[PDB]
Amino acid sequence: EQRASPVTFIIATVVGVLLFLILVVVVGILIKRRR
């Protein structure tokens, strides 16, 4: 629990930031710019 809870939060943060830069920033904001 003491090391496993902050390591699980770092694993969830890196997959959430990777899904935001691909799905929201590239196929969303940058596809609205490239029209």
Short summary:
The chain has 35 residues and is mostly helical. It has one domain (1-35). The chain is 86% helix and 0% strand.
- Would you tell me the structural class of the helices and strands? mainly alpha
> Measured on Cα atoms, how large is the radius of gyration?
15 Å
Binned, the helix content reads: over 70%
Task: Give the N-to-C terminal Cα separation.
Answer: 49 Å
Count every helix, treating DSSP H or I runs of 4 or more residues as helices.
1
Number of domains: 1
Shape: rod-shaped
How much of the sequence is in beta strands? under 5%
The H/E string reads: H
Major β-sheet annotation: none
Subunit structure: Homodimer. Heterodimer with EGFR, ERBB3 and ERBB4. Part of a complex with EGFR and either PIK3C2A or PIK3C2B. Interacts with PRKCABP and PLXNB1. Interacts with MUC1. Interacts with HSP90AA1 and HSP90AB1; the interaction suppresses ERBB2 kinase activity.
Transmembrane segments: 9-31
Protein name: Receptor tyrosine-protein kinase erbB-2
Family: Belongs to the protein kinase superfamily. Tyr protein kinase family. EGF receptor subfamily.
